[PDB]
Design a protein around this nucleic acid. Structure first.
Ligand code: MG
Ligand code: MG
Ligand code: MG
Ligand code: MG
Ligand code: MG
Ligand code: MG
Ligand code: MG
Ligand code: MG
Ligand code: MG
Ligand code: MG
Ligand code: MG
Ligand code: MG
Ligand code: MG
Ligand code: MG
Ligand code: MG
Ligand code: MG
Ligand code: MG
Ligand code: MG
Ligand code: MG
Ligand code: MG
Ligand code: MG
Ligand code: MG
Ligand code: MG
Lengths: 77, 132, 101, 138, 257, 328, 194, 49, 538
RNA sequence: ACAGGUUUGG
RNA sequence: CCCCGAUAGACCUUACCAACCCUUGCCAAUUCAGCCUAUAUACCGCCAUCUUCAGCAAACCCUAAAAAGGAACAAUAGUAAGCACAAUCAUAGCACAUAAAAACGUUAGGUCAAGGUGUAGCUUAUGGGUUGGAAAGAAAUGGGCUACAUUUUCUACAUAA
């Protein structure tokens, strides 16, 4: 009573693949981020807004540290 | 020797209440608990919050009604509203008793974000159970 | 005031951990995996070492709320073994009674 | 002799939405002592026989949580004080409930719940079938 | 820091150390000065440090027929109230530091010869208002107990008398000195002698008696020889009514004999 | 305290009427079994001691027997034995001795006239009569009692019962007699049941050391046991557990005369063997006469085994084994 | 000036209705209860303490507002809110063929200021597989698709969802799982032929 | 928050609604100590002055 | 109130004072909550109740002159500096900013209003809808209605229609002033009522509630247009509120004294409004029952008082009376009719549910309850009312004690009612001689309560306490008690009576000295007959 | 001597 | 007393030390905060031991004086409230057993370091923060686990290999 979770539904919590478009599909970034999305899908304590800054923090960190991803030998965007 | 919650026997002239005349090993046998809530159940939570709130109510009422409190408070907790049952001596006039109850009924409510009830039973003197 | 200076330090440690909870979570997400190449993991280790000391949840000490005892406390009531007895013997704790069996 | 007149003014509407159905409604009330649970069981069964719900009552096994603490303050470990927390359970099984009947029952049940007991309400909601399973082919 | 506080009852119980383990056997008595002060004696529940005047506690509820709002005293008025509050403290400490007065029976630091008041009334309702009593001897008697050891018990000898010839004596023994005093006052009336006084001032003849080991020689005297006797025999005869007597105690001078 | 109890009785009657009004029962038929029942519901106190619960009874059971006044307004006592301390007990002893002397003189005159019309009316064994206890005498005589005077009164009562009894003496000596529960430990025998066209079907329940065992017995089949769906040979590989199964059957010589199916749970192998032993023994009572079930209970088949593991005590090892106590 | 007022007991009528003085849960004021009740352990020569100043009668929860007359009078006015249960479902044999979907929903109550209980998000779905339109291949694929969530003895599929924060979200997600588990069981892929 | 409870109860004691016997006992003992003559020295003159 | 007897209110002033003390503690606690908000900012309840959160008195923005006023208008004296601090920087105020500022003066707040009225008009061309709502409602309380009729002419000229609330105050601003003329001032209201419909604004309930608020003070014969307006209230389709009937019943009470024919119009108007369920939608509904039941209490009508009570207990038993003064004035004159009209059984039945439960009566109902027993000869209930009147009318005891004991001189004293005449006569004598003027008539009653009771001992000791009080009664008491001394054969009493009675020059001493001669012969006290003659001569 | 203090767990 | 405070030490815990910083320095205010500084030989709160021993004890009464003692059941000065013992309660039926309880006092017994504290001492320091270290065993000893096997060891397994 009194908690609506911003009026969100289950398709805003369980399905988080629509936020992984700014990431390499065949690289290890997908292998790693699919795990954080599987965790955020089974995290009932976080909101649909709170998961977004998590995936955005990863989007920002990986796009900020570009030299190590290119010197690691595997290509990533 | 056991000394917890135990008033030592004097020469035979001290007045003691029914709650003090019984050792702590008599709780739930001859005397009951001064507070009732659900946090102390098996699969329940939020127990320490109720313990600290109860101890704050005790230490607050001991200062709010000085020297005129007969015995300990009865803190009943039932459905989001907390009732406080007190036994008070008829040392203060009702004009001040009503001021105090009306002040606490709103101070505790605004401090604990929950409805509180305050009930006072005034006695002529401290009820003696054992030797006096 | 508080009960003790060490409790005043522990509440500050808990506030610092509550402030740096998410950053350490996202940094540990980069170390507790094997998919990422090992090059960035050392930089993540230096990033997590550059964080303030009182930020890790390992520095918190579950002391008593009444007397701030670092040991002999129960997690359910957050009370030391002495204050818990002092409140249970007076009948001020519901459902608690002396075990006789 | 001074009885008020026209004291009943309820606001009850009947919405066109189909009322929800319930197969089995279990109420598990837990407490510390047995007397309050017994009087509350008597009160609940007398409140259910009037609305005609045919409640069934049984007593689940109790749970005793015991622990051991030190008796003295500084150093005495051979002498301990053992504390105990008894938890008694009472099960009220209601069958063939409706959406508003269960509401009017839990209204008179929960508003009158004692202070030292708690209540676990398990509802078995009744449904026929969702829309995409009636007769679909992909 | 608010939950670390206790009640004034336990604070005084921990401060005065009345139930200490050292003052039990007799190691104390060095600093025999114990005084407990009640802190809520002249503490009005309405007044405070800020000087707020609440309509329900400090000031009356209705003034001029209207309601009273939350008001606050001025600084000089609060200084006047705190000056009265501080003055009450020394007013009470003056009544505390002053010792009430005692009457010395035989010397300044003895109980022999001091007045103990009329004895307590009987159960049937008889009141002894004309009776006066005097303590003759107080002695701390000790007994050897198995557990505690030396068991000090005060034994008191008290004599009652009205001044018309009726007088008696008794011994009261108790753990407390006032309890022994009462046990001897209420027990001395049950053993009352009647002393024949010639002309109500002297005895009829010179008596020379020999008790267990005490020799008493008392001689009849005229109206001008007023109570030239032992310091306790003078008190006993002053309780009896004998105004003229000469007594000489030889041998043992035991008070009871 | 003669008036206080009188006022408490009026207040209790008003409380009884009010209780019947709020409970909704007719106040005329409202009895104590409804008073305590309404108190247990209105004030549901959960406490282990029964005397600490809320109770509302007539004041004559709550308040103890108060002593009546002993002297009038002029001070003269009423009874002639008031200056003896125990004016009720000594008066009872005086009346008993006065009736003993009356029986003695009447029997002497009857022996002088050579007439024997009295009988022995002291043997009350088939009735089950006993003497009053000290508490039962302290309830009749309001004043306190001791041991020596009670034994003296009993020894005078037997002296009075050892003589030729009169008419009014027997009704006086009877009022100090108490009738003793049933002195019979004979267990209840279950009747033979017939379920689903099956003859000679009985059931028994046993429990020993946290092991519950229910055994059904058919007296028309051959000798074999089926426990938890598997035979007893594969369920009890040890010969001792199967000897526990042979114990109750060999005692009645019904080895190859009964089929049995058991359901045991909890405990270990010997605890299960003892639970099924007790259940089979309690279930075989229906198929046997009354003389042999008594031999079973005198041989230890129908009685439980209260030997349960004791709880470990704090500061010890095995609830008896103490720690190594160092002298120095 | 001290004043001592006698209680209502001297004014309480013998036929006065009881629910009028105790409408709701009350702290058992001894001045408004005309019943003389003695509660407490007695003294060897004394009696249990009276109701006046008795903390024992104040510790226990009183049921003076739930007497049989008051509960009958309360439910007689509550009979207007409920609806009548259709007698067409008296036995569960017809309830299984009419409403084969069962939704187990949990609800808790606890004394305190907070209401959020993390066990409230749990929604259980129970569907009997003998009431669907599964074919042989669809059923034999759905069994291995669910795994241990479906039992063979009772033949009931159970869905245990706890990932969503809200109970309505967990319900909608359980129905979504039921829809996808019924749909994807009919699609035969290329790796099924081996 | 122990500071909330402490400041609330102390402000209520200064306003005249709560009566803290523990703090009153502390003030009584401190007053008698300062009247005896051993009080609290000023910050900056304990060691030097 | 607290259910404990030590806190239960005894009298009505106590019932008022206990609630006022409790509200004083509520507001004292709320003052602490508002003064120290940081001690309550921590929220523990999940639903986040706003009612228990502290309220803030400070404005958020102080530098911005536009943002500084919207916060201060809602929270008197500080609001006055906001307009000056905004105009110090020559900030342009819109038509929506200063309207609430003028309303903040028109709600709270004679020359400062003019200094504020020049600033709303001279500074900016404000909209008249935000002009009249402040000026008309502010200048009405300042006793200066001349400005409304000046502003109305500019309002009608600015081509803007007048809202419904403007005529709610213009008819008052026109009517309150009367200088030897009434017809013109009543005609102006008809002109404004006729122009209301021409302005295409439907007048709500308040205009037809205020025309009857204006027709009350001036003319008592103005009932004709009041009834016509009450008949026009029913044609449009809106129901008239309770105060609308109250303003009719008040003037009908003003016209009911010289002619009782108008009371039937008061009687047949309530029968149609009692037939439906009402609701307090008009804040002036507090005087309605105060006027509707005072007419029945004045005209002595109980059959209609039963229906004016049923109209109270029909819809809302408590939401129609605001202050306790009118409730206390209500139940006193309600009980004033139930005593002598209807029977004693129903009066005593309505006594125990009204007096100790709802409210305690004043000094007036005590006299009616006393007039209720002596007409029907009810003596078994006199002590029950007496013991209640101690705790109910203890303040008025010194003015009702002369009338509470007089009834015993009119009825008979049965031989069974002696202890009720004894205990009540002892409990009144135990209090006055221990502290309070004592009336002399109560001795004439206490001498007849003990006459038929056969108790002359306790009856004689009382008179010695009055004759020593330096006040002497009439000789009828002495002559009556002489018959008791004659029947008890006690001659030593009249010899101590007449020797202290003849010394103070009583008018019937010639009768007392004759009545003693007849008792001396039957007592055979002829020796003491002439003994007092010698003392009366000496 | 009108005496008092002082031996001892007492 | 010796797997005892501690049902519990990498930083924190930690009160210890070395280097460095701050001194109305947690609180609304306070010539004030704060001290794990000394005193358990000033204490309260909690316990150990006699101790599963039954005695302690208010109010009285008696003794050819009384420091103290107070009993004879075919009875010789003893009545005695109360606290202990006992009974009851708990280990969901009794009985048993266990658990619990065990007064007044002895050991100035343990605990200023659960917490507050009387007295005496610190206040640019015996107070408050950060970093780094608090080893190691020449040796003795208490309590436990593992064994020193054949009634043993390994494997599958209820115990017939
Ligand atoms: Mg500290
Ligand atoms: Mg840790
Ligand atoms: Mg001297
Ligand atoms: Mg000498
Ligand atoms: Mg072992
Ligand atoms: Mg010697
Ligand atoms: Mg460090
Ligand atoms: Mg360390
Ligand atoms: Mg330090
Ligand atoms: Mg010690
Ligand atoms: Mg004994
Ligand atoms: Mg003796
Ligand atoms: Mg005794
Ligand atoms: Mg039992
Ligand atoms: Mg036993
Ligand atoms: Mg034990
Ligand atoms: Mg015992
Ligand atoms: Mg020591
Ligand atoms: Mg030490
Ligand atoms: Mg300390
Ligand atoms: Mg130390
Ligand atoms: Mg070693
Ligand atoms: Mg050990």
């Amino acid at each position: 009573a009194g908690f609506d979770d911003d009026g969100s539904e289950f398709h805003e919590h369980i399905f988080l693949d629509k936020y992984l478009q700014d990431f390499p599909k065949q690289g290890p970034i997908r292998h790693f981020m699919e795990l954080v999305t599987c965790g955020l899908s089974k995290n009932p304590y976080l909101s649909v807004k709170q998961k977004v800054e998590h995936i955005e923090w990863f989007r920002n960190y990986f796009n900020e540290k570009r030299v190590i991803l290119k010197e690691s030998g595997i290509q990533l965007n | 020797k056991n000394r917890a919650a135990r008033v030592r026997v004097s020469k035979g002239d001290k007045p003691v209440t029914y709650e003090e005349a019984h050792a702590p090993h008599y709780i739930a046998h001859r005397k009951g608990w001064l507070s009732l809530h659900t946090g102390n159940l098996d699969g329940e939570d939020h127990a320490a919050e109720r313990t600290v709130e109860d101890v704050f109510l005790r230490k607050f009422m001991l200062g709010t009604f000085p020297g005129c409190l007969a015995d300990q408070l009865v803190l009943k907790r039932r459905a989001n509203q907390l009732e406080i049952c007190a036994l008070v001596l008829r040392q203060l006039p009702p004009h001040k008793f009503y001021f105090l109850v009306g002040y606490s009924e709103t101070l505790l409510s605004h401090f604990y974000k929950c409805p509180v009830h305050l009930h006072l039973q005034t006695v002529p003197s401290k009820v003696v159970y054992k030797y006096i | 005031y508080y009960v003790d200076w060490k409790m005043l330090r522990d509440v500050k440690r808990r506030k610092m951990a509550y402030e740096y909870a998410d950053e350490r979570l996202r940094i540990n997400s980069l170390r507790k995996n094997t998919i990422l190449p090992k090059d960035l993991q050392e930089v993540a280790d230096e990033e997590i070492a550059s964080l303030p000391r009182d930020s890790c949840p390992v520095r918190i000490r579950n002391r008593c709320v009444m007397t701030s005892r670092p040991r002999g406390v129960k997690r359910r009531w957050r009370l030391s073994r002495i204050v818990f007895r002092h409140l249970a013997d007076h009948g001020q704790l519901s459902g608690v009674q002396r075990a006789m069996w | 002799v001074d009885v008020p007149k026209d004291m009943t003014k309820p606001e009850i509407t009947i919405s066109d939405e189909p009322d929800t159905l319930y197969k089995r409604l279990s109420v598990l009330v837990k407490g510390h002592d047995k007397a309050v649970l017994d009087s509350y069981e008597y009160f609940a069964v007398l409140a259910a026989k009037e609305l005609g719900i045919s409640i069934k009552v049984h007593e689940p096994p109790r749970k005793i949580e015991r622990f051991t603490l030190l008796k003295s303050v500084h150093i005495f470990k051979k002498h301990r004080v053992q504390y105990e927390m008894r938890t008694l359970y009472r099960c009220l099984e209601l069958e063939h409930l409706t959406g508003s009947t269960a509401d009017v029952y839990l209204e008179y049940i929960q508003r009158n719940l004692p202070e030292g007991v708690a209540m676990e309400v398990t509802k078995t909601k009744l449904e026929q079938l969702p829309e995409h399973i009636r007769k679909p082919i992909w | 820091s608010f939950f670390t506080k206790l009640t004034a009852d336990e604070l005084w119980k921990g401060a005065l150390a009345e139930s200490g383990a050292g003052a039990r056997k007799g190691r104390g008595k060095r600093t025999k000065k114990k005084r407990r002060k009640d802190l809520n004696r002249g503490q009005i529940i309405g007044e405070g440090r800020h000087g707020f005047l609440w309509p329900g506690l400090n000031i009356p509820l209705m003034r001029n027929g209207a309601v009273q709002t939350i008001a606050q005293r001025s600084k000089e008025d609060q200084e006047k109230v705190e000056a009265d509050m501080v003055q009450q403290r020394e007013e009470w400490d003056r009544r505390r530091k002053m010792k009430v007065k005692r009457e010395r029976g035989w010397s300044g630091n003895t109980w022999g010869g001091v007045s103990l008041g009329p004895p307590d009334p009987g159960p049937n309702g008889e009141t002894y208002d004309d009776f006066d009593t005097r303590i003759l001897e107080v002695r701390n008697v000790f007994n050897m107990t198995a557990k505690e050891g030396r068991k000090r018990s005060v034994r008191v000898l008290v004599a009652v008398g009205n001044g018309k010839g009726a007088a008696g004596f008794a011994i009261g023994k108790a753990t407390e000195r006032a309890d022994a005093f009462r046990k001897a006052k209420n027990r001395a009336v049950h053993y009352l002698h009647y002393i024949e006084r010639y002309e109500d001032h002297t005895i009829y003849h010179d008596i020379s008696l020999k008790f267990k080991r005490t020799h008493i020689k008392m001689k009849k005297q005229p109206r001008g020889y007023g109570l030239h006797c032992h310091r306790a025999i003078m008190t006993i005869c002053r309780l009896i009514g004998i105004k003229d007597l000469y007594a000489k105690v030889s041998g043992s001078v035991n008070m009871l004999n | 305290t003669v008036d206080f109890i009188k006022k408490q009785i009026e207040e209790f009657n008003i409380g009884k009427r009010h209780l019947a009004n709020m409970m909704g029962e007719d106040p005329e038929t409202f009895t104590q079994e409804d008073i305590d029942r309404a108190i247990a519901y209105l004030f549901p106190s959960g406490l282990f001691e029964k005397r600490a619960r809320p109770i509302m009874k007539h004041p004559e059971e709550i308040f103890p027997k108060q002593r009546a006044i002993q002297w009038g307004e002029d001070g003269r006592p009423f009874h002639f034995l008031f200056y003896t301390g125990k004016q009720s007990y000594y008066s009872l002893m005086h009346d008993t001795y006065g009736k003993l002397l009356d029986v003695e003189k009447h029997h002497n005159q009857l022996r002088a006239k050579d007439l024997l019309a009295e009988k022995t009316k002291i043997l009350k064994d088939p009735i089950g009569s006993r003497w009053l206890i000290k508490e039962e005498l302290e309830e009749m005589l309001v004043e306190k009692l001791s041991d020596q005077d009670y034994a003296q009164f009993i020894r005078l009562l037997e002296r009075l019962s050892a003589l030729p009894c009169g008419a009014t003496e027997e009704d006086f000596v009877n009022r100090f007699r108490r009738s003793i529960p049933i002195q019979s430990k004979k267990q209840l025998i279950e009747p033979l049941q017939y379920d689903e066209q099956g003859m000679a079907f009985s059931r028994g329940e046993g429990k020993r050391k946290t092991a519950k065992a229910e055994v059904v017995v058919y007296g028309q089949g051959s000798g074999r046991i089926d426990v938890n769906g598997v035979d007893y040979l594969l369920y009890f590989p040890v010969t001792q557990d199967r000897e526990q199964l042979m114990f109750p059957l060999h005692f009645l010589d019904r080895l190859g005369k009964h089929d049995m199916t058991c359901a045991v749970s909890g405990g270990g192998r010997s605890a299960q063997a003892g639970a099924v032993r007790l259940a089979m023994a309690r279930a075989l009572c229906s198929f046997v006469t009354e003389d042999e079930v008594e031999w079973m209970r005198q041989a230890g088949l129908l009685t439980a085994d209260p030997r349960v593991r004791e709880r470990k005590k704090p500061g010890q090892e095995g609830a008896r084994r103490k720690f190594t106590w160092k002298k120095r | 000036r001290r004043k001592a007022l006698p209680p209502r007991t001297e004014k309480m009528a013998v036929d006065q209705d009881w629910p009028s003085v105790y409408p709701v849960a009350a702290p058992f004021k001894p001045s408004a209860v005309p019943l003389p009740v003695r509660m407490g352990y007695p003294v060897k020569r004394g009696v249990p303490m009276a109701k006046e100043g008795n903390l024992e009668l104040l510790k226990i929860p009183n049921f003076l507002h739930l007497t049989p007359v008051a509960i009958k009078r309360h439910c007689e006015a509550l009979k207007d809110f409920c609806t009548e249960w259709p007698a067409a479902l008296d036995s569960d044999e017809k309830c299984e063929k009419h409403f084969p979907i069962e939704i187990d929903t949990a609800d808790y109550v606890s004394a305190g200021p907070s209401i959020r209980n993390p066990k409230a998000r749990v929604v259980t779905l129970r569907v009997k597989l003998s009431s669907l339109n599964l074919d042989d291949h669809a059923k034999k694929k759905l069994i291995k698709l669910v795994g241990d969530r479906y039992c063979k003895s009772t033949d009931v599929l159970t869905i245990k969802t706890d990932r969503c924060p809200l109970k309505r979200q967990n319900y909608d997600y359980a129905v979504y799982l039921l829809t996808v588990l019924y749909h994807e069981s009919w699609k035969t892929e290329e790796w099924e032929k081996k | 928050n122990h500071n909330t409870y402490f400041a609330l109860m102390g402000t209520l004691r200064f306003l005249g609604l709560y009566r803290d016997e523990h703090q009153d006992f502390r003030d009584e003992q401190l007053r008698l100590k300062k009247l005896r003559g051993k009080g609290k020295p000023r910050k900056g003159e304990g060691k030097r002055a | 109130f607290q259910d404990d007897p030590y806190l239960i209110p005894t009298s009505s002033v106590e019932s008022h004072s206990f609630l006022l003390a409790k509200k004083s503690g509520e507001n004292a606690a709320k003052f602490i909550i508002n003064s120290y908000p940081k001690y309550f900012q921590k929220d523990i309840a999940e639903p986040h109740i706003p009612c228990l959160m502290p309220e803030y008195f400070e404005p958020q923005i102080e530098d911005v002159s536009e943002a500084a006023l919207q916060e201060r208008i809602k929270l008197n004296y500080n609001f006055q500096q906001r307009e000056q601090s905004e105009e110090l920087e020559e900030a342009t105020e819109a038509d929506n900013e200063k309207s609430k500022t003028k309303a903040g003066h028109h709600l709270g707040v004679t020359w400062r209003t003019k200094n504020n009225a020049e600033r709303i008009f001279a500074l900016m061309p404000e909209k008249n809808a935000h002009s009249y709502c402040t000026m008309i409602r502010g200048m009405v309380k300042h006793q200066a209605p001349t400005q409304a009729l000046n502003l109305y002419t500019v309002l009608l000229n600015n081509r803007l229609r007048a809202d419904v609330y403007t005529f709610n105050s213009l008819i008052e601003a026109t009517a309150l002033v009367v200088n030897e003329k009434f017809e013109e001032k009543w005609n102006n209201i008809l002109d404004l009522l006729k122009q209301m419909v021409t302005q295409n604004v439907k007048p709500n309930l308040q205009t037809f509630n205020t025309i009857l608020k204006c027709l009350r003070r001036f003319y008592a014969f103005g009932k004709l247009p009041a009834l016509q307006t009450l008949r026009e209230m029913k044609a449009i389709g809106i129901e008239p509120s309770l105060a609308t009937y109250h303003y009719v019943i008040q003037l009908f009470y003003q016209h009911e004294s010289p002619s009782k024919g108008s009371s039937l119009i008061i009687y047949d108007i309530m029968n149609e409004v009692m037939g439906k369920r009402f609701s307090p939608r008009d804040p002036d509904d507090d005087m309605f029952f105060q006027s509707a039941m005072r007419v029945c209490s004045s005209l002595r009508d109980l059959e209609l008082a039963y229906q004016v009570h049923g109209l109270l207990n029909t819809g809302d038993n408590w939401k129609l009376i605001g202050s306790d003064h009118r409730r206390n004035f209500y139940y006193s004159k309600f009980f004033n009719l139930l005593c002598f009209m209807e029977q004693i059984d129903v009066t005593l039945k309505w006594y125990k549910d009204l007096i100790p439960s709802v409210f305690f009566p004043h000094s007036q109902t005590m006299i009616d309850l006393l007039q209720a027993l002596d007409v029907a000869n009810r003596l078994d209930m006199v002590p029950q009312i007496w013991k209640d009147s101690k705790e109910y009318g203890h303040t008025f005891r010194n003015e009702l004690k002369e009338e509470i004991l007089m009834l015993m001189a009119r009825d008979q004293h049965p031989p069974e009612l002696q202890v009720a005449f004894a205990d009540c006569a002892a409990d009144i004598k135990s209090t006055y001689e221990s502290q309070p003027e004592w009336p002399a008539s109560s001795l004439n009653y206490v001498a007849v309560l003990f006459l038929r009771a056969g108790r002359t001992q306790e009856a004689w000791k009382m008179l010695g306490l009055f004759r020593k009080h330096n006040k002497i009664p009439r000789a009828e008491l002495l002559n009556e008690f002489l018959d008791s001394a004659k029947a008890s054969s006690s001659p030593a009493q009249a010899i101590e009576l007449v020797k202290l009675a003849s010394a103070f020059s009583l008018p019937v001493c010639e009768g007392l000295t004759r009545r003693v001669m007849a008792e001396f012969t039957l007592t055979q006290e002829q020796r003491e007959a002439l003994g007092e003659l010698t003392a009366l001569t000496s």
